[PDB]
RNA sequence: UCCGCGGCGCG
DNA sequence: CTCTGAATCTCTTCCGACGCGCCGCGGGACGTAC
DNA sequence: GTACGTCCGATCTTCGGAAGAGATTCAGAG
């Protein structure tokens, strides 16, 4: 049911929504979206567990 | 691109007292990425009123509006990202945030004519 | 209050009034030079926020 | 007491963004649209006529 | 100099 | 069909005891000249 | 080193409890 309620079924579209709700007002281009996503949980500089 | 639209001026906000280094930084960011066709020229209005005495002497720099600087960007996405990527820059100003609003051409011509007579009383 | 040293303990009311009067003076100066419409709209928004 | 000659009119917060919006329900409007109109994002019509 | 913030303590 | 409508879910605000003693920090930074 | 004019960009993340206003919803007459 969680997948049923999913509004979109595209990885690019998913990056679009995550980029939109990360901070509102910005048009969702793919390059900026992927750069932002790679710098939230997968970048050694702004994210690390001791 | 396929179309040939005029590179009409846009307005981008910057910190007061930091305009010069902001403009220079735009110059090196547009130079290093090597898109000289995408961007034209950047300039901020500046006045040079000279007074012999009374504190400041022989020169005084005044700006009609200090917080804003004009650029020659074109309606795109990568170029706008490059504009916002420069530090000490907040963003575009206009009627709507999603697409920055442009500036009227007739008042651009009027302000250019006004700026064509900056030089007064030489030497 | 002129406390010890060459310093002043400025109340927040003085700072708020100084900001508001500075914005008003800048807008009044800018309105007599026929500034672009977007510029005066943004400055009016800043004054209203202040 | 002194006065500051405001160059442009401004709206009072106490009469705008309280729990009941005075101006909003006086003009039969919600709060979001009047907030958008006052912060220079959208136009409003006066005397539409024909 | 008479104001603000933070901390500790006594009722 | 479609509009209404009463109920329901969601978002925004304000409230949280009273006296006293002591100590320590408070517009700071940033360019522009002198 | 020091007096003086000017000025307000990087990033946050852990309360119940209630009271009220606004958006949603589905229920129904039909």
Place of tokens 């010069």: B20
Give Cα D33 distance to the centre of its chain. Answer: 10
Those residues whose beta carbons lie under 7 A from strand F are: B 17, 57; C 3, 7, 9-10, 15; D 17, 19
d(CA B121, CA B99): 43
CB proximity C49 to B under 8 Å = no
**CB of D11 within 8 A of CB of C48?**
yes
Q: Which nucleotide has the least CA–C1' distance to C9?
A: E3
**CB of D40 within 8 A of CB of C44?**
yes
Which residues, other chains included, contact C21 with Cβ-Cβ below 8 Å and sequence gap of 6+? D4
- How close C23 comes to chain B (CA, Å)? 12
Closest residue to A29, CB basis, from B77, B97, B98: B77
Contacts of B94 in chain C (CB under 8 A): 38
Which residues, other chains included, contact B76 with Cβ-Cβ below 8 Å and sequence gap of 6+? B38
Question: B5: left (phi > 0), else alpha (psi -120 to 50), else beta?
Answer: beta
Helices (H), chain B: 19-33, 78-85, 105-115
Residues shown for chain C = 50
Place of tokens 């009016």: C44
For residue B62, what are the β-bridge partners? B47
C-alpha atoms less than 13 angstroms from C-alpha of A25 in its C-beta half-sphere:
7
Q: Which nucleotides of strand F lie under 7 Å from a protein CB?
A: 13, 26-28, 31, 34
Structural domain span for residue B98: 1-123
Question: H or E segment at C15?
Answer: helix C12-31
Place of tokens 């651009």: B108
Method: cryo-EM
Place of tokens 């995408």: B38
Interface of C with D in 5-34 (CB under 8 A): 20-21, 24, 27-28, 31
- How close B18 comes to chain A (CA, Å)? 25
For residue B43, what are the β-bridge partners? B70
Resolution, in Å, please?
3.8
d(CA B103, CA B11): 8
Considering only CA atoms, which of B116, B122, B76, B79 is closest in space to residue B99?
A: B76
C-alpha atoms less than 13 angstroms from C-alpha of B101 in its C-beta half-sphere:
16
Looking at residue B43, the DSSP 8-state letter turns out to be: B
Interface contact flag, B93 C37, Cβ < 8 Å? no
How many domains does one find in chain B? 1
């Amino acid at each position: 049911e969680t997948l049923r309620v999913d509004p979109t079924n595209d990885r690019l579209s998913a990056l679009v929504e995550i980029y939109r709700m990360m901070r509102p007002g910005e048009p969702p281009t793919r390059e900026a979206a992927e750069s932002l996503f790679e710098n939230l949980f997968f970048s050694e500089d702004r994210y690390d567990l001791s | 691109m396929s179309e040939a639209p005029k590179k009409r001026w846009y307005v981008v906000q910057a910190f007061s007292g930091f305009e010069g280094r902001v403009a220079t930084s735009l110059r090196e960011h547009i130079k290093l990425h090597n898109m000289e066709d995408l961007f034209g020229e950047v300039m901020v209005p500046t006045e040079e009123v000279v007074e012999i005495r009374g504190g400041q002497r022989r020169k005084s720099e005044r700006k009609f509006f200090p917080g804003y600087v004009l650029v020659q960007m074109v309606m795109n996405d990568a170029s706008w990202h490059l504009v916002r990527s420069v530090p000490r820059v907040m963003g575009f100003i206009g009627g709507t945030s999603d697409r920055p609003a442009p500036i009227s051409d007739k008042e651009v011509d009027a302000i250019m004519n006004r700026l064509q007579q900056v030089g007064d009383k030489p030497r | 209050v002129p406390l010890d040293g060459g310093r002043f303990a400025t109340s927040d009311l003085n700072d708020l009034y100084r900001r508001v009067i500075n914005r008003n003076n800048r807008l009044k100066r800018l309105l007599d030079l026929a500034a672009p419409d977007i510029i005066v709209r943004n400055e009016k928004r800043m004054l209203q926020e202040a | 007491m002194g006065h500051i000659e405001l160059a442009s009119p401004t709206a009072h917060i106490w009469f705008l963004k309280s729990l009941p919006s005075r101006i909003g329900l006086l003009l039969d409007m919600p709060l979001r649209d009047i907030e958008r109109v006052l912060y220079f994002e959208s136009y409003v019509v006066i005397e539409g006529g024909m």
